[PDB]
Amino acid sequence: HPCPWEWTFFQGNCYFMSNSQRNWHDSITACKEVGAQLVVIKSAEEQNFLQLQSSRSNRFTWMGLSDLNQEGTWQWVDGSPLLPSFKQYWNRGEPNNVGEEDCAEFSGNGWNDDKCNLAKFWICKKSAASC
Ligand SMILES: COC(=O)[C@H]1C[C@H](OCCN)[C@@H](O[C@H]2O[C@H](CO)[C@@H](O)[C@H](O)[C@@H]2O)C[C@@H]1C(=O)OC
Ligand SMILES: [Ca+2]
Ligand SMILES: [Ca+2]
Ligand SMILES: [Ca+2]
Ligand SMILES: [Cl-]
Ligand SMILES: [Cl-]
Ligand SMILES: [Cl-]
């Protein structure tokens, strides 16, 4: 189950770290085009792994998490709620909704809420067995 050219493997999934930039909704579409999903994080170690990729590349990167539907209620693009323990991953002072910020990104060593219509890099996730 190797990952394809210029994907990244971790714990049985393949991740695509984009080299172009898209707004949040277009990032969701780009992942669906390749049979993947704008990344939904399911564990601490997956968070630590993805956060470090984004931190060391100095790339502000979308993940599949928003509070577009109900301000302050964050939910992943697969419909799962943000668990309270995962709220540890917000950067200090986030989420702050400054000017209305409804989409989550990796920013430095944790997460930031930012404007969904900003173009950022993105990460898709797909099982390695499905390639
Ligand atoms: C509409 O929001 C703004 O005018 C500002 C708010 C923040 O200014 C504080 C000085 N850094 C900036 O917002 C960025 O950084 C924040 C963390 O410091 C973060 O929570 C925000 O999501 C955003 O990434 C700058 C911002 C602005 O309009 O200028 C870029
Ligand atoms: Ca809002
Ligand atoms: Ca918000
Ligand atoms: Ca913010
Ligand atoms: Cl790309
Ligand atoms: Cl593109
Ligand atoms: Cl999706």
Domain span including residue 67: 1-131
Q: Which ligand 1 atom is the nearest neighbour of the CA of 94?
A: 20
Which secondary structure element, helix H or strand E, spans residue 49, and what is its range? helix 44-56
**Structure determined via:** X-ray
98, 103, 109, 113: which to mutate for ligand 1, most atoms within 8 A of CB? 98
CATH number of residue 19's parent domain = 3.10.100.10
- Contact at 8 Å (CB) between 28 and 40? no
* Tokens encoding 70: 């109900």
Cβ neighbourhood burial of 42 (10 Å; 0-12, 13-18, 19+): middle
Residue 39 CB contacts under 8 Å (≥ 6 apart), including other chains:
15, 50, 63, 64, 123, 124, 125
Q: Which ligand 1 atom is the nearest neighbour of the CA of 107?
A: 24
Number of domains in the chain: 1
* Resolution stated for this PDB structure, in Å: 1.4
